[PDB]
Amino acid sequence: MLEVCIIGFGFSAIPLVRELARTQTEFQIISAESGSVWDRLSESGRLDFSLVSSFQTSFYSFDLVRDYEKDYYPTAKQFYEMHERWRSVYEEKIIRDFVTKIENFKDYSLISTRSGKTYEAKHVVLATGFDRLMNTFLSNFDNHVSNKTFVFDTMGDSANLLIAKLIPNNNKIILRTNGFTALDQEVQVLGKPFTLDQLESPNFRYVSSELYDRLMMSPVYPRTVNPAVSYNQFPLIRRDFSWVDSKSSPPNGLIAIKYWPIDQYYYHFNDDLENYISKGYLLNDIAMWLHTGKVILVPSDTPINFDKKTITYAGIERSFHQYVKGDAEQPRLPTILINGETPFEYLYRDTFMGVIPQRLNNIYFLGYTRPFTGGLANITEMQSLFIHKLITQPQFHQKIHQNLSKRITAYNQHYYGAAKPRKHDHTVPFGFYTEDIARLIGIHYQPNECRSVRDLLFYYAFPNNAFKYRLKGEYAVDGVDELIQKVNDKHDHYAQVFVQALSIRNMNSDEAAEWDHSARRFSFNDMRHKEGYRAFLDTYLKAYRQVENISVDDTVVDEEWNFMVKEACQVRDKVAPNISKDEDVNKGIRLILSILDSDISSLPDSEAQSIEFIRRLLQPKNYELLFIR
Numbered sequence: 001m002l003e004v005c006i007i008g009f010g011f012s013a014i015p016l017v018r019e020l021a022r023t024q025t026e027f028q029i030i031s032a033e034s035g036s037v038w039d040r041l042s043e044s045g046r047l048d049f050s051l052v053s054s055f056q057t058s059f060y061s062f063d064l065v066r067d068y069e070k071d072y073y074p075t076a077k078q079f080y081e082m083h084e085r086w087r088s089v090y091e092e093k094i095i096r097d098f099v100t101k102i103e104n105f106k107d108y109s110l111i112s113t114r115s116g117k118t119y120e121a122k123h124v125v126l127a128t129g130f131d132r133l134m135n136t137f138l139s140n141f142d143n144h145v146s147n148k149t150f151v152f153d154t155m156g157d158s159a160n161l162l163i164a165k166l167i168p169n170n171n172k173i174i175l176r177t178n179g180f181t182a183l184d185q186e187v188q189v190l191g192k193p194f195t196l197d198q199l200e201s202p203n204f205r206y207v208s209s210e211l212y213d214r215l216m217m218s219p220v221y222p223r224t225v226n227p228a229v230s231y232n233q234f235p236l237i238r239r240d241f242s243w244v245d246s247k248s249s250p251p252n253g254l255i256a257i258k259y260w261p262i263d264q265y266y267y268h269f270n271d272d273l274e275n276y277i278s279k280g281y282l283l284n285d286i287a288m289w290l291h292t293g294k295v296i297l298v299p300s301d302t303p304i305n306f307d308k309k310t311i312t313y314a315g316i317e318r319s320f321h322q323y324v325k326g327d328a329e330q331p332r333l334p335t336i337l338i339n340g341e342t343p344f345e346y347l348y349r350d351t352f353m354g355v356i357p358q359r360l361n362n363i364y365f366l367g368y369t370r371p372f373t374g375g376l377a378n379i380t381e382m383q384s385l386f387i388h389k390l391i392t393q394p395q396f397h398q399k400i401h402q403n404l405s406k407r408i409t410a411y412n413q414h415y416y417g418a419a420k421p422r423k424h425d426h427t428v429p430f431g432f433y434t435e436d437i438a439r440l441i442g443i444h445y446q447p448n449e450c451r452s453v454r455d456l457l458f459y460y461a462f463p464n465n466a467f468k469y470r471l472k473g474e475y476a477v478d479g480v481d482e483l484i485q486k487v488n489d490k491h492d493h494y495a496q497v498f499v500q501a502l503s504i505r506n507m508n509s510d511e512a513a514e515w516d517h518s519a520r521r522f523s524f525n526d527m528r529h530k531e532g533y534r535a536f537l538d539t540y541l542k543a544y545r546q547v548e549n550i551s552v553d554d555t556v557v558d559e560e561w562n563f564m565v566k567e568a569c570q571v572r573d574k575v576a577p578n579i580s581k582d583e584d585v586n587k588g589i590r591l592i593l594s595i596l597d598s599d600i601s602s603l604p605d606s607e608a609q610s611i612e613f614i615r616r617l618l619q620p621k622n623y624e625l626l627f628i629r
């Protein structure tokens, strides 16, 4: 009898397959001849973009340990190359077929294929990823079309990449949307580049919900009146968050597009522009697009004729070439039949940690949890660890399964509360999720075990990447020591985010919102760092056009667009003329680095009550997670 069958092999399954190989667990992989989007994009020559996620969070520990030199955004091409290197390694263990049905019994599953070949397997893992409506538009849709109007119903990562591609052909972009959360993927900290995932210091939630909330949420909730911020200049991007019913912020089910803000894009790519473009570094600055009106927000309920092929705004019946409905995201699950008979119904909440469904035996889900920020690698590597422990250690299997139902309920209570299931429940803060799995598995760190300020910096402020939890213990990966050192030396041991936590420990929600936006460039959607980049934008469009062999007359005038652009940018034109963090952080960092190797418990009483606070980081009050305990 087959111990393990892995169904679906592209990206999510690699870390698990590695662990099974390490334990010499008998396993087979079944995966489609036809492959993924990535195979689609590759053969159509459309691996011409870059990830919205840091290298650190997007490639697995056992790669980063070899190839991490600096932070950078890997290209689509490089991401694919990495799937293909690991496919090549495990190809012998892969059967090229398509699974059509799984009949789940008491301690095994019957797997049916399109070939008609049948497979029996004790443990069955699904890693089939998602069908995505939008894949066609990246797959196939023409990036040679010009001067047309697109209407997008939802903003997501795919809409932003497509928009990135449509702007340089004077395509006009209307978002008829119920708001969206966009976040500069890269941020200046005293003028040094940090990917937004470097600045989340998630374990600060253990100090309190309240503190972690003002640490994180002012760029997402509309809490500041600072007129430099995109959600005051353009209030249409504001969202209905009344669905959030949890103390854990940012909440499960919050999604965001991560994007190049043009200043960081400039800093990175100005000196070899066309070369950088043609590798796949595309400017996708939604904030810049709104500033310059190459995109407009219109109200959600703006009238629209799909027959007449027009939308009514600015008292204009505007014709449009295409309405893009936006990215529905469906797990690619084959039919799963319970004890031979009853259809299993997938619902992320009805599953433990996105991984363990309730009425099935020895079936695990790998790749169906979405990280709020950073790459899937964080989620998928930790899930692979969790699934490997469940499959090979019956003690672990039993401990987790005994009370699976109460674990799921306690998880859903903590993270979702009374909220009805939403289609984005699969989305989680990466540094909560990785930490969650690490405490489940037992490869977590103990706050109580920090000795130096340095240890407190590593515990609280070093990002909860998967490889953080592979330094020591059951899932240790050689080279993680040197990776963490490298990463720590390059980022000042993450003292700047640690000092942010110090700085707002005593503020209320509104004080922290104001403080976060007092900076000369606050982290996300700072509209003061846009005008000065109009010239560069034209160089960029010229450069994009020369890489993709495009011709466009920039003198054509769409006076309806301009009336529309003017109608849309009314609040902005009112609010933009009305236009501490850098100082506090600057001092905080000087202080922390001065006591790096200073012993914690030892530190002296009443540089004020901030030491009292640093000392209480050994005994955080919000450490309980009832779906673990």
Ligand SMILES: Cc1cc2nc3c(=O)[nH]c(=O)nc-3n(C[C@H](O)[C@H](O)[C@H](O)COP(=O)(O)OP(=O)(O)OC[C@H]3O[C@@H](n4cnc5c(N)ncnc54)[C@H](O)[C@@H]3O)c2cc1C
Binding pocket: 007, 008, 009, 010, 011, 012, 013, 030, 031, 032, 034, 035, 036, 037, 038, 050, 051, 052, 053, 057, 058, 097, 098, 099, 100, 127, 128, 129, 130, 132, 135, 138, 158, 332, 333, 334, 366, 367, 374, 375, 376, 377
């Ligand atoms: C356009 C795009 C951009 C993305 N950008 C990023 C990014 O910047 N950063 C990031 O971290 N993530 C990104 N992702 C998300 C994620 O990294 C990819 O979706 C990744 O492909 C998911 O890996 P997977 O292994 O879960 O699924 P896939 O890579 O889709 O692989 C699953 C495999 O299983 C096969 N399969 C499915 N059903 C069956 C079946 N019944 N039987 C047999 N085989 C089956 C499929 O053919 C496929 O080859 C992006 C996704 C897309 C679509």
Ligand SMILES: N[C@@H](Cc1c[nH]c2ccccc12)C(=O)O
Binding pocket: 183, 196, 197, 199, 200, 215, 216, 217, 219, 373, 497, 500, 516, 523, 524
């Ligand atoms: N702590 C950083 C980074 C940050 C804030 N909110 C975020 C949301 C998502 C990711 C990163 C962040 C800041 O306050 O600016």
Ligand SMILES: N[C@@H](Cc1c[nH]c2ccccc12)C(=O)O
Binding pocket: 052, 053, 132, 134, 157, 158, 327, 370, 371, 374, 375, 376
């Ligand atoms: N799901 C990706 C983000 C992403 C980028 N491009 C996409 C297109 C479609 C769906 C998701 C995406 C992640 O986990 O980081």
